[PDB]
């Protein structure tokens, strides 16, 4: 039988993730909670700027949503301790508020009679945190995992890779990233200088820590990667551009290859390389969680890289969530 | 002696107002109040995305933001009882914050020693509202009043020009609106469904007020005229798109005359006209909190018209508050 | 069997139109022309900032582009003479080039075995001009026709509802309206000083004849409706704001009864209402020529109104280039 | 006595060419050639969407420009032969048409009397390349030279300071880039796949040959630069993002120590360091060919670093070609 699970939070992930629980078959969506009231939670599920209209029946009876007539239970409540997902057979909680990153929080959710808790961002502590592709392997049935970040969804794949046939010394990565919700839509205050400044309107850098966290997917790393994010003004579609050394003389022609083998093997439905020169807006609402743009891929000096590789910042990482929860099931 | 005025809320409106005062002579800011630490209060001052960069050096001194050597003293409180203004020497609040809009609530400055305080938005009460050009001559010295929208001083003289030269039968207005900080950047949970949709890649229909309440300081458009807004991905500046039915028949050339003239006589500094055929970009940091678009003007079958007037949404408002303040004290 | 038609221009209103004929069954694209290589076409056709990545193989041999498997013959010249569209079983041209916008022009297709020519623009002399539910019951088999353009289509349908049901003394338009091809991504030489001007950073007047033509379409609003343009940055979807006069008073609930009346009846597939508050995005790839905002429908003072009417001023248009084709053949 | 000069091509760069030209007294402008009426050179010299309204009177006296009374002799011709530039005193030409970027090509100006060419892009023949603060001490009094493009004239000053200080052993560098008139406004026919694709709704990369090149103004660099573009929807202002394996173990405060003192002796003007966290439009209309973000500098596993540094790269560049023809005149 398919997985039920429950979202908290109903953002951007939250209700890209619902989408595509929707699609499939193996995985079931049983309940929900966010601070809306059921009208504006109906209307943003229903329309999306970036992902277009749901196509379907979006209705509510009291506080169940009716999509496609099938009743989702949905709480509005900040405190975990009003929230019953289990009640309503969740046996998976998708945490998508932000909010909840550490274990210590998300042991409530198994207190409750939840069975495993996945982070729809790296944790705040030492939660163990998995990556498909890159350590799904190792899963070891942990009640409470990360996913670790959408980024890390793109670079873990793409190193991966690159560790495998090549070995990587050192690299820095720069996102070329989407506008999000942590950012001011006109200058005003946020949590720093830099986020407070209108997001449609700029180059934005900002933090991300993805890079020096690959260490908890990929140990080999510890220590060989940095990064950072320039926030441009695109509503959704993100690139990484990783600069590397690697252990040995490469070429263009073996990296690009050495992505279409995974891309066919064990990074399938993952990475994929785009071999017809799209652009950003071509990546909406792709579920791959990287996309190497193989004619961009530069070698100089034997060992000295750089790979593009797109992500669709939501719905990317999205699809991942619910392939995390199918596996971990 | 220059009037010595506090900016309550250091928001668009604040900061605008904050560099318009530093401008000229007949007025000096005293002291300010936001929830923001004095850190980023600098970076936001200093730096805007919109108006450029502040000419002149930008510093602090504990909780004194100091402005080409001139100490503005910076209060960091919600609550009206914590901001002694008048102990800094201000004699008018500017109210900027959008959450004291009755005279109940201005009330507690006027307690507090501050002679009067300007609304920088409509009243939510009968709080007596005044705008320059419109009905700024019959101000009766009263304590509290509504300097009314940006909206208003854009659509309130355009109509002063038309009533007092031809007579205004009925109409209705759409606003073709920049973004504002009241909308979200991506879709997220806002007041209202559309306002949740992203600002930066939609148009998106909103509410004014700004029409019906042109009765408050044009009493023979009671029941005339009502008004709507589309907001677009433009980060400011904004356009009164006024259709009426006139009291007679009109001509274009005899309605552009019209404007001229008052534009060099009873609305000089508050109406001009276009005749260059300028963009919006072209109005960004304009003083004029109306500037009627010359070739743009229509009329059909005699006495129904079209005006197009461009305002800075934050800098002809802004430009009023100044000018308010410099009048009543 | 399927009407057989041809493309000239494979530009936005080209390519919507082939991918609209693709999905239905009634009409079959068999030939098109544009001044681009081969390469260009396909990828242009297959991946769309707007309308998404075409769904099926978009392949070529030769100068056929293979979709789904079906030839169509490419031509890859300016001059209508190299242009045997009739040779590849075409009965109609969708003159989508914009350059070919005179009776004397399109009977050079006639003369060379093309039955009927639909030119997707207003005609520059008198050549006979159609829309459909507003006068394309009166089309008496004329070999040559205009579609008129994407406003036409927008606003002609919200007329028909308007003078059927209450009478148009008068009214004035203007489309807020998403960038074009026709204007400059950045400040550099254009066909006029405003088209001159960064579309993606500024709100642009730019005129429409739309309105005065409508007397083409309903001669009964000869004389009594004229119109402008805002320019706005959108990518596409744009709205009819109409205010008008009516013969007598009317209620906010009579309009949008009659447009829902006319949405199930005379104007079904053509003019639809939207009851649930969408904004422009939400539009994309909507294949109605007009769908009224139904909140937004404003009247004062008995007979004087405001209705706003989305249009996909792609799609929208181009699904009625389609119709249009089908309905004459 | 100030050279004197003349701008061939009015768009972007040879518009704020001379507003430069006119902010100083050590140069002035004496003639323009594009292929625009008198009408529209003067609307797009007086308003610009980006670097704001001329200050001063901007007239016409048939086919001079008046500038602050001063007469500029306006050419209107695609040939070379037709532009007496020296008749009207010019000593050097400014060649900002993207058109006449061979020695051959600009052969013509110097047989009609000019002294000396700056082509305002890269040489496509053999024509000596020179950048300010980079090899300008090279320069050998040459007649035609090259002023290298946007991106050379940050990267260029940013590798002159990692090589005099440290050594640079291999780099790749990724331009993050306002869009350009090279680029379409919607998906339409450009020179290759990813030009054609809307620019202002995108990330687009983009060919950049400016770090290859490099060996051009720093021969050392042979062979160990390369770089590429990634186009995104700001109208103006760039960043150089460059990752590099240098000689020896630095420091991050090594290396902006480093650029703070080149700031302040050999790159005064051209390279400076940001301290304050701003974002891409804080540099809009800066002079400044770098400007090294410091907090973003980056070093991982002792020798590989990352540096961001902003460019203005419409006026960064313009500033610098004035700069070269007084420097050469
Ligand atoms: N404690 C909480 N309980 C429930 N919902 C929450 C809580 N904190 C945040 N949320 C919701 O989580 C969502 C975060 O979504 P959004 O801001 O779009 O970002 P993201 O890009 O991470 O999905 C919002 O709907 C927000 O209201
Ligand atoms: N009660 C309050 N006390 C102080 N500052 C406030 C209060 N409420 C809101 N503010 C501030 O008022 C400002 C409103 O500015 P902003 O959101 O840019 O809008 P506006 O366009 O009206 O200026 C913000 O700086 C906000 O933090
Ligand atoms: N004479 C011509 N012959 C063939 N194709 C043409 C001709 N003139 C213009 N075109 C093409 O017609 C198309 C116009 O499309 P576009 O500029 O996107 O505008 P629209 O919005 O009207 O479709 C382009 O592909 C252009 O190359
Ligand atoms: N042969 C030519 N003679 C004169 N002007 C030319 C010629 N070729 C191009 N131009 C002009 O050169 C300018 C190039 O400007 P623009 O497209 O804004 O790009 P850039 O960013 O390089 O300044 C335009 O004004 C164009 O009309």
Chains 1, 2, 3, 4 share one sequence.
Request: glycine share 6%; with cysteine; hydrophobic share 40%.
């Amino acid at each position: 039988m398919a997985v039920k699970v429950a979202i908290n939070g109903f953002g951007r992930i939250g209700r890209c993730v619902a989408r595509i629980i929707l699609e499939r078959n193996d995985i079931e969506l049983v309940a929900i909670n966010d601070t809306t009231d059921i009208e504006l939670t109906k209307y943003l599920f229903k329309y999306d700027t970036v992902h277009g209209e749901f196509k379907g029946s979006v209705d509510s009876e009291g506080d169940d949503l009716v999509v496609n007539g099938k009743k989702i239970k949905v709480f509005k409540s900040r405190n975990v301790k009003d929230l019953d997902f289990a009640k309503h057979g969740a046996q998976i909680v998708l945490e998508c508020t932000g909010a909840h990153l550490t274990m210590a929080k998300c042991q409530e959710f198994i207190d409750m009679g939840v069975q495993k808790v996945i982070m729809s961002a790296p944790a705040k502590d030492d939660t163990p945190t998995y990556v498909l592709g890159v350590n799904s392997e190792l899963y070891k049935g942990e009640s409470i995992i990360s996913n670790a970040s959408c980024t890390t969804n793109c670079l873990g794949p793409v190193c991966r890779v690159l560790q495998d046939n090549f070995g990587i010394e050192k690299g820095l990565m720069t996102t070329i990233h989407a506008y999000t919700n942590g950012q001011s839509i006109i200058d005003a205050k946020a949590k720093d200088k830099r986020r407070s400044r209108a997001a449609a309107q700029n180059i934005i850098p900002t933090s991300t820590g993805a890079a020096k966290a690959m260490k908890l997917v990929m140990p080999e790393l510890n220590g060989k990667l940095h990064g950072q994010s320039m926030r441009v003004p695109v509503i959704d579609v993100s690139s990484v551009d990783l600069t590397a050394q690697l252990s040995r003389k490469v070429s263009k022609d073996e990296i690009n290859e050495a992505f279409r083998k995974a891309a066919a093997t064990n990074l399938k439905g993952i990475l994929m390389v785009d071999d017809d020169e799209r652009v950003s807006s071509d990546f909406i609402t792709c579920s791959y969680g990287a996309i190497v743009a193989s004619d961009l891929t530069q070698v100089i000096a034997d060992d000295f890289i750089k790979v593009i590789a797109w992500y669709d910042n939501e719905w990317g990482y999205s699809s991942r969530l619910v392939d995390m929860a199918v596996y971990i099931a």
